[PDB]
Amino acid sequence: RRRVIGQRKILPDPKFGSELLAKFVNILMVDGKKSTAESIVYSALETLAQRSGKSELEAFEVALENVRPTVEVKSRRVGGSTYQVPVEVRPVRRNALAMRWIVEAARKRGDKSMALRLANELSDAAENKGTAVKKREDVHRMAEANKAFA
Amino acid sequence: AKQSMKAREVKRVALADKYFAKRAELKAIISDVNARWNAVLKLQTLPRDSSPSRQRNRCRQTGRPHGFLRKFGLSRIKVREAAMRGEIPGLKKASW
Amino acid sequence: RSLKKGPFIDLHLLKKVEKAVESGDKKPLRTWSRRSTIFPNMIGLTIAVHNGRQHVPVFVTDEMVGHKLGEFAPTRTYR
Amino acid sequence: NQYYGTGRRKSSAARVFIKPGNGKIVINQRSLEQYFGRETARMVVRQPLELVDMVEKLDLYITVKGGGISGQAGAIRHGITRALMEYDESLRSELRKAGFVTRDARQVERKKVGLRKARRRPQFSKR
Amino acid sequence: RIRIRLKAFDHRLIDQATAEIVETAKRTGAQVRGPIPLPTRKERFTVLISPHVNKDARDQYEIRTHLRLVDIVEPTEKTVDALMRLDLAAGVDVQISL
Amino acid sequence: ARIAGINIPDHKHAVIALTSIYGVGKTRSKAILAAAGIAEDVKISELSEGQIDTLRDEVAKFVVEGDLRREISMSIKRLMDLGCYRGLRHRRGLPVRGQRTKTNARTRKGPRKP
Amino acid sequence: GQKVHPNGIRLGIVKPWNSTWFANTKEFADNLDSDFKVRQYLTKELAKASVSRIVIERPAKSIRVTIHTARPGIVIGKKGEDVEKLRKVVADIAGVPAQINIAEVRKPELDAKLVADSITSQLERRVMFRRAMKRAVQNAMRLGAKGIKVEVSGRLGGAEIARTEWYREGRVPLHTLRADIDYNTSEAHTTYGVIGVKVWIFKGEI
RNA sequence: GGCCGGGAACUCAAAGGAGACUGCCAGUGAUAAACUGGAGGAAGGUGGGGAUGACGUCAAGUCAUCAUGGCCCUUACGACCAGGGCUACACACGUGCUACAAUGGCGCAUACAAAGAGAAGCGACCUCGCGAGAGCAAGCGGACCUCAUAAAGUGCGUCGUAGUCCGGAUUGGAGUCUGCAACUCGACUCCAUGAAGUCGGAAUCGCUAGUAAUCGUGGAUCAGAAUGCCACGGUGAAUACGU
Ligand SMILES: [Mg+2]
Ligand SMILES: [Mg+2]
Ligand SMILES: [Mg+2]
Ligand SMILES: [Mg+2]
Ligand SMILES: [Mg+2]
Ligand SMILES: [Mg+2]
Ligand SMILES: [Mg+2]
Ligand SMILES: [Mg+2]
Ligand SMILES: [Mg+2]
């Protein structure tokens, strides 16, 4: 409300040193088990970076580039009616949502081990193939379909 | 409190001491692995209320069978009530 | 039934039941020591166990020994 | 000659001994790696070092206790950067500039009465 | 070679008893080990404040049992009795041992 | 192989497989191996002849499959036909371990009977 | 109902304990019981003694029992007679060598317990409940002090519906730990109902 | 082996003291209050959290803690004893614990903590026991001794997505211990049995940081029945445009 927090500075990626990558590990992290998280992020970040051949953060970026929404609808209760109005998503949010979607979808990929799942979803994303990108499509389709209010 | 009950406790106290205190030993004795004696094991039948696990402390001040604190020997209520007037030494609102 | 070593019972039933052993079977045995284990001496005897309401005609049986005279007299009334 | 640095965080007391010589690192009478080896921990310890040369700079004697893994590690890093000031009161400006000289006043909160975990308020549901 | 277990409820009091035992003992031979503090055991007490219902009430009290070590090194003939000539304060508690 | 009857566990380690034998758990299964002279990781299926032979022969000691599920019901009856609180409970679909009936007992009685 | 007990919330500072004596967990329990038995007896046997406080120290198997009465004369008796009398009883009631010292009083109109115990007594005397309030206040505020607050519970005048009365002069910051307030109560057993009483006397800040 | 002299440095212990005031800097604000950043500093904007709850509101709760006006019971609404009941079960509602697993299970190896409890107690060592536990018996009224070899975790290996080495309810057989006393109705151990459960509708709850989440630890009551309550520390997030 009146408050004005902001962006809680996150500790840079250890094996690398990228703030973005760092928060990506937290999103996947669970029960405050930060170690277990990294043990999964890298293992899958490697099995993929290998195939792509290019540096992790590149294949990583590309993957996100697809699962990157530009606009989304924001609920608004104005006039005894909840009108769904779309709006361009800020830069920071874009990366966040993407990462969140990637994991949330990767976690439920029915594979064998989280690592493998993550690796796959991360790939499929880099070419609108997995569920991550799917979300963005449904979200982006939400907008425009409400562009009237936009 | 219940006067009747209040005194009920007292009797169980005396008995437990005036008897088992120097008799209950029988257990670790003839009722334990040495020579465990069905006969002696049937003898314990006489005191009953002499058993220790028959008291209920009760608030010394009042008698509340529940709210109790071995330390002060008072009921959860009296403790607070007295502790405030400074009747209890070294006891005050704890915080940290 | 856990009682480690030593089938416990009340002195009452003992002194009374033993008399039955010799005097032979006869009238029941008004007893409240439902927490006492059954013995082969009272085997097929005429006993009686309380249960809040009154007593019940309990009769010892072969296997019916290592148990308590109480686990044969239901207490709570249910439909 | 020899220097000492306290350092502590999250109930984690550490004792560092800045001493000139290559770059040995022995914590609690054990190797740096025999404690944090192959773990994301043995990095913070070197942070103050990696920031002003090490391995070929000097060797300190670490003696930490109380706390935990991240606690120990974080604590030691404090003692080190702390003692460093003794050997050179100038490099501080930089150590501080990187959030080192400071002490994480962050500490587990006591479980308040009424709640379920210092903050966790049990659901009441029925309104 | 003689230990003195000093126990008081309030530090203000205990300190006096200590500074006293040591003060006098210093002029009777013994060099004394020193007025050591030692950890303070504090028993806490949580208890319901309101009678009947209202579990989310409760109230917390505590008892800080302060203590000191003392322990006089190189005791003396007069020293021992020199303590009888000085031993008051009801709030404090002593336990001289070997 | 039948081993004790029907039950033909394969692939799974000898220990974890043997447990399939109606009447044995991690304990009885883990011991029967060494006692017979069989490892743990050993796949009952991959095992050589004798490596399965001894099994049956040794498992013949403790009661299993039929006999167990068989006599096990007899003990339940012994007390039921007796008339003790225990048996009485079974013939009423109520817990004997002395649990609460007014609530939680779906495992004993079953799903709601509204 | 809220508001924490002042003398209790100040048991650490600006306010001394009424029973300063050490004791271990074992006998600490019983140690209070006696402390209790002696107090009531010392209170009953000393009705019109006008006693306010009653500290209790327990040294080596000995007892202190420092009485703070407004009328020591009676408490003393013919050449320490009354006092000596009590002492014996206490020692017996506690089963140990008990003593008893008398303490005067810095104006009763300024002591909590007193102003209370008194203001309540008046009620039983069929005095206008309201009058007692103001009466006690006027004095306290006059004999000194910087603040006072009298409070009579319900059933005033004998109304079918009990109602607590207010009234208070001077500043009485109960929120200030470093304020020192002489607070005490006393129930007035009327011909038809009890009547609680609470007195708040603020003498000085620090 | 701080083990021994020895050393009071360091950690710590615990009494006293210093330190933070929007005090200083600049900017917006009338050259106010303030706000917003910056410096310095362990900490910066009532530093974190406690304690502290105005006048009063609900004839809110409590004559079962206690006290008490009134009204009632006085070989009876009073008092004693054994057994039983308060643990009933076809249901429904609230609060919780443990699961549905591979961020996991299982085996072995193995690292870091805090806070507390204790002479009718904590109880080691060694002996026996599959184990609960038993025998003998030291030490400690306690920074000496004991409760007490923290869990997650880290290494290696196994498992292979299976109602599955998941999950444990249920029940059967046999036992340990507490107390006269374990049927009704204790806790736990051993073997066996191995359900539902595959992340849960409408709806709904808590939480803004050492918080949530998660993992262990102690205590009160107490002979003996904690997943409750109170408390401790390990690891350790996400998000906050805006009303
Ligand atoms: Mg009464
Ligand atoms: Mg009891
Ligand atoms: Mg915690
Ligand atoms: Mg305030
Ligand atoms: Mg009402
Ligand atoms: Mg009455
Ligand atoms: Mg109940
Ligand atoms: Mg205990
Ligand atoms: Mg316990």
Q: Which domains does chain E have, with CATH numbers?
A: 1-98 (3.30.70.600)
Pair of tokens at residue D116:
């379920």
Enter the DSSP assignment of G144: S
Q: What Å value separates CA B18 and C1' H182?
A: 27
For residues E68, E72, E73, E79, the Cα torsion angle rounded to the nearest 10 degrees is 180
Angstrom CA distances, G55 to G38, G60, G82, G87, stand at: 11, 17, 19, 14
Helix (H) or strand (E) holding B87: none
Angstrom CA distances, F97 to B10, D108, E62, F90, stand at: 38, 42, 43, 11
C16 touching F, CB under 8 A? no
Query: Which amino acid is it at E83?
Result: L
The neighbour count for residue E21, using CB atoms within 10 Å, is 24
Residues D83 and E63: their CA atoms lie apart, in Å, by 39
The neighbour count for residue A86, using CB atoms within 10 Å, is 21
Work out the burial of residue E97: count CB atoms within 10 Å of its CB; fewer than 13 is exposed, 13-18 middle, 19 or more buried. exposed
Pair of tokens at residue A71:
């606009």
Same domain? G98 vs G113: no
Residues A61 and A20: their CA atoms lie apart, in Å, by 10
CA–CA min distance C17, chain B (Å): 15
Q: What Å value separates CA E36 and C1' H16?
A: 15
- Give the closest nucleotide to F13 (alpha carbon vs C1'): H165
Q: Which phi and psi angles does F104 have, rounded to 5°?
A: 55, 105
Bridge pairing between strands E59-68 and E41-47: antiparallel
Angle ∠(F108,F82,C43) on CA atoms, nearest 5: 150
Q: Ligand 6 centre from B95 Cα, in Å?
A: 40
The DSSP line for C13-57 is: HHHHHHHHHHH-S-S--EE--TTSBP-TTSTT--EEEE-SS-EEE
* Exposure string for G98-136, b = 16+ CB within 10 A, e = fewer: bbbebeebeebbbbbbbbbbbbbebbeeeeebeebbebb
Angle ∠(G86,G92,G96) on CA atoms, nearest 5: 110
CA–CA min distance D114, chain E (Å): 5
- Quick one: which of E36, E30, E34 has its CA closest to E73? E30
Do the beta carbons of residue G32 and residue B88 sit within 8 Å? yes
Regarding chains A and G, contact by 3 or more CB pairs under 8 A is answered as no
Pair of tokens at residue D53:
């040369």
Do the beta carbons of residue C26 and residue C20 sit within 8 Å? yes
Enter the DSSP assignment of A89: P
Do the beta carbons of residue G83 and residue G77 sit within 8 Å? yes
Residues A93 and F38: their CA atoms lie apart, in Å, by 60
Q: Which phi and psi angles does A98 have, rounded to 5°?
A: -50, -55
Residues G136 and D124: their CA atoms lie apart, in Å, by 48
Residues B21 and B47: their CA atoms lie apart, in Å, by 12
C11 touching B, CB under 8 A? yes
E3 touching D, CB under 8 A? no
> Coil, strand, or helix at residue A31?
coil
Angle ∠(G68,G70,G72) on CA atoms, nearest 5: 80
Give how many domains chain G has, as a whole number: 2
- Quick one: which of B74, B65, E49, G5 has its CA closest to D114? E49
Residue G205 lies in a domain: yes
In the block, tokens 């006692």 appear at F35
Instruction: Provide the residue range defining the domain that includes D114.
Output: 1-127
Residue B78 lies in a domain: yes
Residues E93 and G27: their CA atoms lie apart, in Å, by 14
- Quick one: which of E74, E41, E42, E77 has its CA closest to E60? E42
Give how many domains chain B has, as a whole number: 1
Do the beta carbons of residue D101 and residue D95 sit within 8 Å? yes
Q: Using a CB-CB distance cutoff of 8 angstroms, which residues of chain D are in contact with residue A35?
A: 39-40
**Which residues are within 8 A (CB) of D96 and not within 5 positions of it... i.e. 6 or more apart?**
D102
Least CB-CB distance to G21: which of E7, E88, E91?
A: E91
Residues B12 and D45: their CA atoms lie apart, in Å, by 66
Instruction: Provide the residue range defining the domain that includes B51.
Output: 1-86
Residues D8 and C30: their CA atoms lie apart, in Å, by 76
Alpha helices in chain E (DSSP H): 11-25, 77-82
Give how many domains chain D has, as a whole number: 1
Residues D42 and D31: their CA atoms lie apart, in Å, by 10
Do the beta carbons of residue G34 and residue G97 sit within 8 Å? no
Query: Which amino acid is it at G193?
Result: G
Angstrom CA distances, F89 to C68, F3, G197, stand at: 16, 36, 62
Same domain? G58 vs G89: yes
Angle ∠(D106,A42,A123) on CA atoms, nearest 5: 125
The neighbour count for residue A76, using CB atoms within 10 Å, is 12
Do the beta carbons of residue E96 and residue E4 sit within 8 Å? yes
Which residues in D1-127 belong to E strands, given as ranges? 18-20, 25-27, 30-31, 58-62
Enter the DSSP assignment of G98: B
Bridge pairing between strands A71-77 and A82-88: antiparallel
Q: Which phi and psi angles does A118 have, rounded to 5°?
A: -50, -55
- Quick one: which of C15, C63, C3, C8 has its CA closest to C34? C8
Do the beta carbons of residue G20 and residue E91 sit within 8 Å? yes
Q: Using a CB-CB distance cutoff of 8 angstroms, which residues of chain D are in contact with residue E56?
A: 113-114
Q: Do B71 and G7 touch (CB under 8 A)?
A: no
Bridge pairing between strands C30-31 and C47-50: parallel
Residues G23 and F90: their CA atoms lie apart, in Å, by 58
In the block, tokens 């692939």 appear at F11
Residues F20 and E98: their CA atoms lie apart, in Å, by 67
Helix (H) or strand (E) holding F22: none
**Which residues are within 8 A (CB) of G56 and not within 5 positions of it... i.e. 6 or more apart?**
G18, G19, G20, G21, G35, G38, G39, G63, G64, G65, G66
CATH superfamily name and code, A19-142: Ribosomal protein S7/S5 (1.10.455.10)
Regarding chains F and A, contact by 3 or more CB pairs under 8 A is answered as no
Residues C53 and C72: their CA atoms lie apart, in Å, by 15
Query: Which amino acid is it at F82?
Result: L
- Quick one: which of A14, A24, A16 has its CA closest to A122? A24
Least CB-CB distance to E62: which of B77, B89, B94?
A: B94
- Quick one: which of E31, E35, E27 has its CA closest to E1? E31
Q: What Å value separates CA A89 and C1' H239?
A: 15
Pair of tokens at residue G106:
């810095």
Residues E83 and E70: their CA atoms lie apart, in Å, by 13
Residues F98 and F100: their CA atoms lie apart, in Å, by 7
**Which residues are within 8 A (CB) of F20 and not within 5 positions of it... i.e. 6 or more apart?**
F7, F9
- Nearest chain F residue to C64 by CA distance is F82
Helix (H) or strand (E) holding E7: strand E6-8
Residues A103 and A70: their CA atoms lie apart, in Å, by 19
Residues G169 and G136: their CA atoms lie apart, in Å, by 11
Regarding chains G and F, contact by 3 or more CB pairs under 8 A is answered as no
- Quick one: which of C69, C36, E93 has its CA closest to B89? E93
Q: What Å value separates CA C76 and C1' H195?
A: 29
Instruction: Provide the residue range defining the domain that includes G196.
Output: 107-206
Q: What Å value separates CA F55 and C1' H165?
A: 20
Do the beta carbons of residue A121 and residue A105 sit within 8 Å? yes
Q: Which phi and psi angles does C38 have, rounded to 5°?
A: -80, 140
> Coil, strand, or helix at residue D25?
strand
- Give the closest nucleotide to A118 (alpha carbon vs C1'): H103
The neighbour count for residue B77, using CB atoms within 10 Å, is 18
Do the beta carbons of residue C45 and residue C60 sit within 8 Å? yes
CA–CA min distance F78, chain C (Å): 9
Angstrom CA distances, B29 to A126, B23, C4, D10, stand at: 82, 10, 16, 55
- Quick one: which of G112, G115, G5, G56 has its CA closest to B85? G5
Q: Ligand 1 centre from F43 Cα, in Å?
A: 77
> Coil, strand, or helix at residue A83?
strand
Q: Which method resolved this structure?
A: X-ray
**Which residues are within 8 A (CB) of D38 and not within 5 positions of it... i.e. 6 or more apart?**
none
Do the beta carbons of residue E1 and residue E30 sit within 8 Å? no
Residues D29 and D65: their CA atoms lie apart, in Å, by 12
Angstrom CA distances, F18 to F23, F35, F45, F114, stand at: 10, 14, 11, 42
Residues A71 and A59: their CA atoms lie apart, in Å, by 24
The neighbour count for residue D123, using CB atoms within 10 Å, is 7
First-to-final CA distance of chain G: 28
Same domain? G130 vs G180: yes
Sign of CA dihedral D88, D90, D92, D97: negative
> Coil, strand, or helix at residue C76?
coil
Q: Which phi and psi angles does C44 have, rounded to 5°?
A: 55, 40
Bridge pairing between strands C30-31 and B92-93: unpaired
In the block, tokens 């490099």 appear at D91
HSE-CB for G194 with a 13 A CA cutoff:
5
Residue B30 lies in a domain: yes
Same domain? G73 vs G138: no
- Quick one: which of D49, D66, D67 has its CA closest to D58? D49
Pair of tokens at residue F108:
């004993």
In the block, tokens 């990462």 appear at A99
Radius of gyration of chain B (CA): 19
Q: Ligand 7 centre from D22 Cα, in Å?
A: 72
Do the beta carbons of residue D95 and residue D80 sit within 8 Å? no
Regarding chains E and G, contact by 3 or more CB pairs under 8 A is answered as yes
Least CB-CB distance to B90: which of E48, E49, E63?
A: E63
- Give the closest nucleotide to G193 (alpha carbon vs C1'): H69
Closest residue (CA to C1') to nucleotide H102 in the complex: A113
Q: What Å value separates CA E83 and C1' H53?
A: 51
- Quick one: which of C63, A140, B88, B59 has its CA closest to G18? B88
Q: Ligand 8 centre from D6 Cα, in Å?
A: 38
Residues E16 and E39: their CA atoms lie apart, in Å, by 18
**Which residues are within 8 A (CB) of A93 and not within 5 positions of it... i.e. 6 or more apart?**
none
Nearest bound ligand to CA D120?
A: 3
Work out the burial of residue D73: count CB atoms within 10 Å of its CB; fewer than 13 is exposed, 13-18 middle, 19 or more buried. buried
HSE-CB for D25 with a 13 A CA cutoff:
23
Residues G179 and G181: their CA atoms lie apart, in Å, by 6
- Quick one: which of A55, A54, A65 has its CA closest to A99? A65
- Quick one: which of D85, D60, D76 has its CA closest to D9? D76
Nucleotides of H under 7 A from a protein CB: 9-16, 36-37, 40-43, 47-56, 59-62, 64-70, 78-96, 102-104, 111-114, 116-120, 134-135, 141-144, 150-155, 158-161, 165, 169-173, 175-188, 190-196, 204-215, 220-223, 229-243
Helix (H) or strand (E) holding E42: strand E41-47
Same domain? G150 vs G65: no
Which residues in G34-85 belong to E strands, given as ranges? 51-55, 66-69
Chains that contact E by 3+ CB pairs under 8 Å? B, D, G
Share in percent of chain A as helix, strand, coil (round to 5)? 55, 10, 35
**Which residues are within 8 A (CB) of A55 and not within 5 positions of it... i.e. 6 or more apart?**
A49
Residues E59 and G2: their CA atoms lie apart, in Å, by 13
Radius of gyration of chain D (CA): 18
Work out the burial of residue G172: count CB atoms within 10 Å of its CB; fewer than 13 is exposed, 13-18 middle, 19 or more buried. buried
Q: What is the 3-state secondary structure (H, E, C) of G167-201?
A: CEEECCCCCCHHHCEEEEECCCCECCECCCEEEEE
Angstrom CA distances, G92 to F55, F69, G95, G96, stand at: 83, 75, 5, 7
CA–CA min distance F86, chain C (Å): 8
Residues C8 and C68: their CA atoms lie apart, in Å, by 10
Listed residues G88, G106, G124: the one ending a domain: G106
Nearest bound ligand to CA G177?
A: 4
Listed residues G106, G124, G153: the one ending a domain: G106
Do the beta carbons of residue F72 and residue F12 sit within 8 Å? no
Enter the DSSP assignment of G154: S
- Nearest chain C residue to B37 by CA distance is C6
Residues F85 and F89: their CA atoms lie apart, in Å, by 6
Work out the burial of residue F38: count CB atoms within 10 Å of its CB; fewer than 13 is exposed, 13-18 middle, 19 or more buried. buried
Work out the burial of residue C72: count CB atoms within 10 Å of its CB; fewer than 13 is exposed, 13-18 middle, 19 or more buried. buried
In chain A, where the domains are located: 19-142
Q: Ligand 3 centre from D108 Cα, in Å?
A: 7
Angstrom CA distances, B33 to B28, B39, F40, G74, stand at: 8, 14, 43, 68
Q: What Å value separates CA B66 and C1' H144?
A: 38
Do the beta carbons of residue G188 and residue G194 sit within 8 Å? yes
Listed residues G85, G106, G127: the one ending a domain: G106
Determine the residue among B33, B34, B42, B46 to mutate to test chain C binding: the one whose Cβ has the most chain C Cβ atoms within 10 Å: B42
- Quick one: which of G135, G142, G149, G158 has its CA closest to G197? G149
In the block, tokens 């990095």 appear at D43
Same domain? G142 vs G196: yes
Q: Residues within 5 Å of ion ligand 1 by Cβ?
A: B 1
First-to-final CA distance of chain E: 6
First-to-final CA distance of chain A: 25
User: Where on the phi/psi map is residue B2: left (φ > 0), alpha (ψ -120 to 50), or beta?
Assistant: left
> Coil, strand, or helix at residue D6?
coil
Angstrom CA distances, E51 to B86, C15, D21, D115, stand at: 21, 51, 69, 20
